[PDB]
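Problem statement: downstream parser choked on a complex file, so we are re-checking the raw output for the 2-acetamido-2-deoxy-beta-D-glucopyranose run. The parser issue turned out to be on our end (a line-ending mismatch), but while we're here, posting the original submission so the record is complete.
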Amino acid sequence: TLVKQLSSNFGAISSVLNDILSRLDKPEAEVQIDRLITGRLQSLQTYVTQQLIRAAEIRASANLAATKMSECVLGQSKRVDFCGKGYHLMSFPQSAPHGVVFLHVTYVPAQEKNFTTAPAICHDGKAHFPREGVFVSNGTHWFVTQRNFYEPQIITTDNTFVSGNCDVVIGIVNNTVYDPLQPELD
Amino acid sequence: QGVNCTEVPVTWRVYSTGSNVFQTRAGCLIGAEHVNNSYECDIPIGAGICASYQTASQSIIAYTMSLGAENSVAYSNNSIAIPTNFTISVTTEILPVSMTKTSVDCTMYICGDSTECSNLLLQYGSFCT
Amino acid sequence: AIPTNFTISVTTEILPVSMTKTSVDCTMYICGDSTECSNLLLQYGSFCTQLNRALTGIAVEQDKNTQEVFAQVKQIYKTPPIKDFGGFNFSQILPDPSKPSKRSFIEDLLFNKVTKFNGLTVLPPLLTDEMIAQYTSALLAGTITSGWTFGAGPALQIPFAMQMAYRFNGIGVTQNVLYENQKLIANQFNSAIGKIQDSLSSTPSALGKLQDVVNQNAQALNTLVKQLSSNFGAISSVLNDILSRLDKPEAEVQIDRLITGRLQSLQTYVTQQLIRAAEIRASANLAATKMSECVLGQSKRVDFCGKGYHLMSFPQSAPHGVVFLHVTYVPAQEKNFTTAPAICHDGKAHFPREGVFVSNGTHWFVTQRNFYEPQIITTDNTFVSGNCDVVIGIVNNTVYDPLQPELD
Ligand SMILES: CC(=O)N[C@@H]1[C@@H](O)[C@H](O)[C@@H](CO)O[C@H]1O
Ligand SMILES: CC(=O)N[C@@H]1[C@@H](O)[C@H](O)[C@@H](CO)O[C@H]1O
Ligand SMILES: CC(=O)N[C@@H]1[C@@H](O)[C@H](O)[C@@H](CO)O[C@H]1O
Ligand SMILES: CC(=O)N[C@@H]1[C@@H](O)[C@H](O)[C@@H](CO)O[C@H]1O
Ligand SMILES: CC(=O)N[C@@H]1[C@@H](O)[C@H](O)[C@@H](CO)O[C@H]1O
Ligand SMILES: CC(=O)N[C@@H]1[C@@H](O)[C@H](O)[C@@H](CO)O[C@H]1O
Ligand SMILES: CC(=O)N[C@@H]1[C@@H](O)[C@H](O)[C@@H](CO)O[C@H]1O
Ligand SMILES: CC(=O)N[C@@H]1[C@@H](O)[C@H](O)[C@@H](CO)O[C@H]1O
Ligand SMILES: CC(=O)N[C@@H]1[C@@H](O)[C@H](O)[C@@H](CO)O[C@H]1O
Ligand SMILES: CC(=O)N[C@@H]1[C@@H](O)[C@H](O)[C@@H](CO)O[C@H]1O
Ligand SMILES: CC(=O)N[C@@H]1[C@@H](O)[C@H](O)[C@@H](CO)O[C@H]1O
Ligand SMILES: CC(=O)N[C@@H]1[C@@H](O)[C@H](O)[C@@H](CO)O[C@H]1O
Ligand SMILES: *[C@@H]1O[C@H](CO)[C@@H](O)[C@H](O)[C@H]1NC(C)=O
C-alpha cells in the first residue's frame, strides 16, 4: 500500500516529479510538488502510525509468549486454561518463522462412575473426616479415595482425622473406622 | 446491512428477488433459506444469525445459532462422580513474537532523486526524522 | 495473632469487554452523494480503503473479545429443578425460569443502571444479550453443581457443601471448619449477596467503567459529525452550495479544501478508535483470564480476584462487559497468643506439621493458621529433626505419645 501511494497523484497534474518539472516553468512546479509532498508525507505518517499500533499488538503477544515459556515450560502452572485444557503436566516449545509454538501436555479425567458420598463418618460418636480424599460408597461398603482418580481404600484411622461430635455435621453417616494396630495390640 | 426487506428493488439486481428473503436485525438477507434448525456458528451474520452451505439440496441456509449441546449435571446431596481412567492430551498453541523489521528513507520515498523536491521537503522540519 | 472467626465477603469487579461495532463509509462521509467530490477523492489513492478496513477490523475484534470471555464452556449446563445447595441460595444470580428472557435479578439490575447519520452505521454483535445470558448461566450451573471439574474436562457432580470444603482446603483451612459452621457460612454468603443488590442499585458510579466506554465512543462520533460543518477554509461547508454556485474549475478548489479537512478528521477518528480498541482488547483479555482462573478454578493469586482468600467467583453479564462476584474468606477476631518455632522434649527438637505452636499462658497447643483450633501436642501432629541445642526460640515442653497408654 505504501509503495502504491506514490502513483496516487494527490491533486497534482502528475504523480511523476520529472513530468512536473519538465512541463512547468518552476513557480507552478513548486506548487504541484508541494501537493505530492503533502500526500506522500501523509502516507508515511499513516504507515508508521499503523506500524506502531501493530507493534504494540505483537509486543503484548510476545510478553504473553514469554510468560508462558516461563510458567509452562520452566515449571508446572496451576493456572486454569492457561496452558491448555485439562490439568497441566508439562509443555514443549517449538520455534516458528515469526513466533513460538507450544505443545501443552495435559491430564484429562475420563470414564467417571457415580458413587454415593458423605462429608464424614460417624464412629463411636466421633466425626471422622477424610485426609486428602473423599468418602464414597458402592451401595454397600464405604471407602476413601483420592478425589481425582478412583482408587478406593479401606477407611482407617490413618486416612481420617477427628474433630468434634456427630451432631453438628449435616450429612454424616454411620460406619466403622478401622484401627491398624488393633490386631497387634490385643 | 441495516436495510429493511421492503427496499432493494427486484449495479446488479439479480439477487434482489423474492421468496428467499429473510429479515434480520443485521439487515435484509437475500438468497438464503431460513430454517428452524439451529447449528454451530459457520458464517456469522449478526444478532445470533448465521449462515451455512447445506448439502438441504446444496444450498445456503440461515439459522439462529446454537451455543452448544445441552447438558444437565446429576446433582444431589449425596452423589459424586469420580474418573476411573484418564487420557493424556496434547494441544497446540500458536503465538506471534515478532514482526519484520523495516525502515524507510523518507527523502527517497518522497523526493527520490529530484533535487527540486528535496529542497522543498526541508520546509517540513523534523517530520522525516 | 491468630483469627478465631471469619466472614464471607462478596465483591464486584467490573470489566469492559467490547465496544459498539461502529463503521463509517469513508467516501460518503467526505463526499456525500456528490459525483465531482467523489472523483476528486479518488486522487488520494487508498486512503479511503485503509480507513474502511481499519474500522472493519475493529468490529471483528469486538465479537472476538466477547467470544473469548464468555464462550469458555463446551456445553450449556442447567441447574436441577430442585435447588438444594446446603443452605446457599443462588436464586438472585441464576435465571428466573418464569420469565423466559432473563437475565437473573442481578443481571437485570446491571442492564438498567447502564445508559440521522451520514455514512455512519452501527452493526449488531454476533452474540445477543440472551445468548450471553445463556453462556453465563451455563458457567454458573457448572460452577455450582460440578465445581471446577467442568473446566478441565467432563462435568463431575459433587454436593455443594463438599465442594466448599475443598475450596476451604485451598485456603489452608481444614474441612471440619466448614462442616461445623455450615449454617453460619451459608448465612453470611446469602447476606453478602443481598448487599450486592443494594450496592449496585445505590451507587450511581458502580458501573462507571462500562459507562465510560460508551461515553467516549459517543463523543468520538459526535465530534466526527460536527467536523462536517467546519468549512475548512472554504466558502461553504456544504458541498451542494459550492457546486450550485461555482463553475467546475473554481468548485474544485473549494472542494479540495473540504476533502483535505474531512479526510484528516476521519483519519484522526480512526486512529483513536484503534488505540481505544487496544485498551478494550486488553480488558477483554483480562476478563477472559479471570473467567478461566476464578470461575473455572480457584486462584491462588493475591488480590487477583477480590480481597481476602479466594473461594469462588460467579460471573454476571452486562451491556458491554462482564461482572464478577468474588467470594472470599476474610479472617476475623484475632487473638494474641505466645508462640515458639519448636518444642524441646528429651533433647529432641519437635516441629509442627502444617500448623503453629501457641500458648494461652499456661498450656501449649498446635493450632491451625487462619482459624485457631488448638490441639494437644502429640507425635502425630509434630515431627522431629535435630536436637534442642540448635533452634533459637525453642521452648521446653512434653509431646504426648498416643501409643503409650495402649502398651502401658
Ligand atoms: C453418568 C451417569 O450415567 N449419570 C447418571 C445420570 O445420567 C442419571 O440421569 C442419574 C439419575 O438416575 O443418575 C446418574 O448416576
Ligand atoms: C455393591 C458392591 O459392589 N459391593 C462390593 C462388595 O461385594 C465387595 O466384597 C467389596 C470388596 O472390597 O467391594 C464392594 O464395592
Ligand atoms: C445430605 C443430605 O442433605 N441429604 C438429603 C436429605 O437431608 C433430605 O431429607 C432428602 C430429601 O428428603 O434428600 C437427601 O439428598
Ligand atoms: C446415620 C445414622 O446411622 N445415625 C445413627 C442414628 O440413627 C442412631 O440412632 C445413633 C445411636 O442412637 O447413632 C447414629 O450414628
Ligand atoms: C421504514 C420501514 O420500512 N420500516 C419497517 C416497517 O415498515 C415494517 O412494518 C416493520 C416490520 O417489522 O419493520 C420496519 O423496519
Ligand atoms: C417452532 C416452529 O415454528 N416450527 C416450524 C415448523 O413446525 C414448520 O414445519 C416449519 C416450516 O418451514 O417452520 C418452523 O418454524
Ligand atoms: C482401566 C481401564 O479401563 N483402562 C483403559 C484400558 O483398558 C484401555 O485399553 C485404554 C485405551 O486407551 O484406556 C484405558 O483408560
Ligand atoms: C464464635 C463466634 O463468635 N461466631 C460469631 C457468631 O457468634 C456471630 O453471631 C456471627 C455473626 O452473626 O459471626 C460469627 O463469627
Ligand atoms: C438473600 C436471599 O438469598 N434470599 C432468598 C430469597 O430471595 C428466596 O426467595 C428464599 C427462597 O427459599 O431464599 C432466601 O435465601
Ligand atoms: C490481638 C491483640 O490482642 N492485640 C493487642 C493490642 O491490641 C495491644 O495494643 C498490644 C499491646 O498490649 O498487644 C496486642 O497483643
Ligand atoms: C524467640 C526468642 O528467642 N525470643 C527471645 C526473647 O524472648 C528475649 O526476651 C530476647 C532478649 O530479651 O531475645 C529473644 O531472642
Ligand atoms: C531457659 C530455660 O528454661 N532453659 C532450660 C534449660 O536450662 C534446660 O537444661 C533444658 C532441659 O535440659 O530446658 C530448657 O527450657
Ligand atoms: C489454657 O487452656 C487450658 C485448657 O484445658 C485451660 O485449662 C487453661 O486454664 C487455659 N489457660 C489460660 C491462661 O487461659
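For whoever reads this later: Chain C touches chain B at residues 63, 71, 73-80, 84, 86, 121-128, 130-131, 134-135, 138, 141-142, 145-146, 149-150, 154-159, 161-162 (CB under 8 Å).
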